[PDB]
Subunit: 348 residues, 4 copies
């Protein structure tokens, strides 16, 4: 019978914790280096979302200087987007990426971006397993046989495989886990992100193709978990939004400091439309460099606790335990009133 | 032993998500057409609840114009109910339904409604598996052999089967999931709605009889899930209550705009009574046509994500994953303050 | 290995719902009659807690008049307790019970209560499986071979069995589920109440001995569930506290009307003590008769939905489904603002 | 496949309850005596955290007088720490412990503490399975063959074993359950505490080595559970913070009385640092002696309910049931407004 076609149970970040192990690794000796694509290395496993409230040249420069790579968003003219890529390239040999989406008629944007020296092109869609997206990847790969191309987003083994066979240099994973996302609520479609990363990685591992975990990262411990689940690096929006280097001005509202943060599927980013994201504000965070130091500090401390000398060790060898709701509540601060916010644990 | 007679675990909407798949379907090319009954087609898979704060001729007209069908409520005289059915029929060949409940002595209401040209009669009860309800269905089917009859509500395979054998043209499913319902709390009786739809559909599928999923639909993603669970269309109360076309005037209260919305089992709708619903208010929503566009937009986007070309594909082929509480929390917007409500994600 | 000695998973009320079935039963034709003990019948399956903020003669009279039985509390002199039992007996042949606890030196209280015509003696302890309690039961049974004796509380098969072999006429079940109870938090000891009732009943059924489900009943649906789990009737404190007939005066506080309600293990009821209950206030509820009508209305409607003609049918034949947290949230009223509290669903 | 490397499910305090059993034990006849180490007995199973807002000589004296042992913290000079150990020793032959952490260069602190008469040395780390910690234990054990040494923290069987083989006299268990801890959130690493205690004890039991359960104890029932899980005693911070005897002055804030309580991994305790704890305030609690009486009262009442004559009986024979979220909610006080806080159940 099995009238209800339930393929399996799926987990996200708050369903699991990493198990501590024998370790000779110290936090400050952990090696954070990793891969974005088969041919592009990173010194830290962080990439910035291709969103108009997160990544232009300014943030892409600060991030590349810390060892990551920024993806310049496409909500600007072809000329401005190429100028922004070029600005990153002439700021000290830094690497940069750029998003172009998946619609037809992006050829001229793609050509401008390759000419401006873009290191990696992101063909990104809310549905990477769409035949349109797969065909744009094939055409771009035939047109530019040596361009590094990231394609996404998928949330399944099958999708990771279709992207790899279409020619991607990395698979980006995540359908609906984003802070600003309403896709799962408005469509009913999604896969909890830890299960999505692991399913994608089980395929991509076979071809040596890295998986980028995109969306849903809120605390530095979610980075650790995303990597242990199979990701080679993570993509973040909300963790970098609100930084000084992110686009837009600081807004003061009811004693607090904010920057705008919105989904690229929100009515405002898209300009009757049916949106799959919201328009919001995110607490001002100060300089990207300090945020990065705190988040990588957490990852470093995990690598010490797990005995993971390198990111590959965390990604292929660390183990999880599955926890309940009570388990998650124990993991947070509890039964004490906080008198000073820690820089790596800001709730409100 | 098994002293505790637990038949199985049961799931509702927030326990599951739909898995994305290979798709050539685009949202605006998805085919939304479906069946209400074996012989009555709909252009969209939405029917309105037979409630006195949701459906009279006005809403039934607007909905039929969008491709759905409205069920005129029975809290009015036989004459007014027939006049309302007739008003829908002479508003451009629109289809209309009407509720009559299940008590004896409804014969003359039934005759008036058939004469006024009603397309589908709803014999609706809070307990469709009641022998009284089954006998009213049999008598109505012998009296009107070609009248389309919907019978409900049930929440089990056995109940769906008893309704089919009594002569129904469609089975309506749902015991207790409604927004305004206190049945499960006051009686202890109910079945989580995704499991209820799937159990009913496993039976009804064998006879080609559609299942209508009634109650508990809050976001457009719940529509997708209800169909993937086996429903051919959904019935909604609260999603249409508060629209301009729903009965009753707009109430202004503490800066906000409302319309009355109440269970038909509430003390007010029934006039010592023991109620199984409450009397409430629901946010003013504006015109039904825009609400419908947003909800069908979500369903369309699901069909694109799932590669479901038609509603039948979603209903018989899409797959689910089971999620935890943490999974559901990730699916909503999280860790960002919303500055503008999206029209398809209004919380408060 | 199994270092963690976990005997099994256990459930309470909000973990389960009752499945609707074929029914010829109508709510107002359901038979509510049941057994308190092997030899004492009740017209409704409700008994009142032996608490000093719930049951003296006044409430015990009103309840017996509705078909239940009240247990007079022991926080008064032997003489006052016998006078209260006698007052119920001379108010029209009504049945009455009285609590005496389990400490040595209760012989003279017991003799006074039997002489005042008590129908049923409650030897009640927070730990019915205590050897002291079992020996007081044996001695009382040898002293009064025809006195109906209820012993409790237990939460296991083994405990139910030890009480039966000690000579009880009914087993009372519940360790820690009470509204006003902190036992499980302060000791770490308890069994979720639906599992506790079913385990006890699996034993008691073999001897024809009824089980009384004591504590944790909040809504009328919990009564249905407690019986379907194996109870012959339920004992309630908080549902009857705050009624006009319960002991104590109405307190007005911040616009609302209250009566005191406290655990018998609270510091105030016991007068360095280590309490296992709290002192509180409970909303004023009006007359017991109307409360009873609402709660039995819910039970009646369950019996209609489940096709349970008698309480025995509900107790031995109805089936459950296990639900998630999302299931429970769907069961309550949701996504609507309540404008008028229903008499059987008062939250605040 | 099993791409997601999930070793097993893990539980903490709120996931389980203890099952009541046949008992001849009365609360006030229960024997609370236990072991801290193989060679050091305690009269009650409570030790105080080595934190600068919890334990100096003053609290260590009051606790030892009640039958426990206090661990003097190391955020002071070697001389002050030895003077504090000495003060406890000359306050009536009381036992005392002292923390030294795990970094190299602690030799001279260790020598000063042994000379000042410390009974037990705590070599404590946030990662007891670190090779650095294991080597400091070996060196300290070769240097002081008869010094009782506690090593920690671990959360696994493997870790308990590595500590035992390094020479510890007791294993301290807990990675991340502390009130003031953000390790699990900032690193992603941790094990729910009931599972952590049981896994560690399965190893330590084989060598007769006690396990100390450290962190996450909020109510006296958590003590019972920690012992039944395999601990010989518990270590607490927040339960003793805010007592009169704990370090620091009472702070009055918004009508309420507090003392500072902070993680030893917090930015303030450590003085760019990446912290693993927060700085907070905890309600003023009054004298340690009364707190201890309430907490041991709860444990005593558990031993009565479980028929556990001694702590060893609770630790090796008591059984658990696994509960849901609804189970935990039933265990707390519910559906009543508390008018007087009980001394053993203070929420706010
Ligand atoms: C492309 O950026 C995304 C991504 C990566 C994801 C989602 C999403 O909604 C958007 C915005 C949707 C946009 C800009 C409309 C164009 C399109 O539909 O491709 C999602 O739910 O999971 C992943
Ligand atoms: C009939 O409308 C419903 C339906 C469809 C359902 C329930 C319900 O309470 C009412 C109102 C109950 C009324 C009007 C009283 C008459 C009766 O009892 O039939 C429910 O809980 O699941 C389904
Ligand atoms: C006896 O009334 C109870 C019962 C029935 C239960 C509990 C309880 O705390 C009390 C009050 C405890 C009292 C009055 C102290 C005397 C004693 O201990 O027997 C409980 O937790 O489950 C069941
Ligand atoms: C040592 O005290 C602890 C313990 C016992 C634990 C944790 C922790 O963060 C600290 C403070 C961390 C400090 C003082 C920094 C030095 C170090 O790292 O050892 C934890 O998460 O589980 C157990
Ligand atoms: O409007 C949107 N709806 C849904 N997902 C979006 C939208 N805009 C961007 N995203 C995705 O959300 C991610 C950011 O998630 P975050 O880091 O949790 O804030 C982006 O990298 C995209 O994958
Ligand atoms: O008083 C009531 N109690 C319980 N269910 C009701 C009541 N009135 C109507 N219903 C059901 O609730 C459904 C509406 O649910 P909603 O769409 O979640 O607001 C209706 O279609 C009926 O099935
Ligand atoms: O102080 C107490 N602590 C724990 N349980 C108590 C206490 N006083 C009474 N009880 C139990 O709690 C029951 C009432 O539970 P209630 O109906 O949920 O309010 C009583 O019948 C007793 O079994
Ligand atoms: O900063 C910190 N971060 C994490 N754990 C800490 C920190 N400081 C102390 N601890 C641990 O937390 C325990 C106290 O937990 P508590 O009793 O739940 O308040 C201590 O005994 C240590 O094991
Ligand atoms: K914690
Ligand atoms: K989301
Ligand atoms: K409901
Ligand atoms: K309780």
């Amino acid at each position: 019978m099995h009238m209800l076609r339930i393929a399996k149970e799926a987990l996200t970040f708050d369903d699991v914790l990493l198990v501590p192990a024998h370790s000779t690794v110290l936090p400050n000796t952990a090696d954070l280096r990793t891969r974005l694509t088969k041919n592009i290395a990173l010194n830290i496993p962080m990439v910035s979302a291709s969103m108009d409230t997160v990544t232009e040249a300014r943030l892409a420069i600060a991030l590349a200087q810390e060892g990551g790579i920024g993806f310049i968003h496409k909500n600007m003219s072809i000329e401005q987007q190429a100028a922004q890529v070029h600005q990153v390239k002439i700021s000290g040999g830094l690497r940069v990426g750029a998003a172009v989406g998946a619609a037809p008629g992006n050829e001229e944007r793609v050509k401008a971006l390759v000419e401006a020296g873009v290191d990696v092109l992101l063909i990104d869609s809310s549905h990477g397993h769409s035949e349109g997206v797969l065909q744009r990847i094939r055409e771009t790969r035939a047109a530019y046989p040596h361009l590094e191309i990231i394609g996404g987003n998928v949330a399944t083994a099958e999708g990771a495989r279709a992207l790899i066979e279409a020619g991607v240099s990395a698979v980006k994973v995540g359908i609906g886990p984003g802070s600003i996302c309403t896709t799962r609520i408005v469509t009913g479609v999604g896969v909890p992100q830890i299960t999505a990363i692991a399913d994608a990685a089980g395929v991509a591992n076979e071809y040596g193709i890295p998986v980028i975990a995109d969306g849903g990262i809120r605390f530095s411990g979610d980075i650790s978990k995303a990597i242990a689940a199979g990701a080679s690096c993570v993509m973040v929006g909300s963790m970098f939004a609100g930084t000084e280097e992110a686009p837009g001005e600081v807004i003061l509202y009811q004693g607090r400091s904010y920057k705008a943060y919105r989904g690229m599927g929100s009515l405002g980013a898209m300009s009757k439309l049916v949106p799959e994201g919201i328009e919001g504000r995110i607490a001002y965070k100060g300089h990207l460099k300090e945020i990065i130091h705190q988040q990588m500090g957490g990852l470093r401390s995990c690598m010490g606790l797990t005995g993971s000398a390198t990111v590959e060790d965390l990604r292929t060898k660390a183990q999880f335990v599955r926890i309940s709701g009570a388990g998650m509540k124990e993991s947070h601060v509890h039964d004490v009133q906080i008198t000073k916010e820690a820089p790596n644990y800001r709730l409100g």
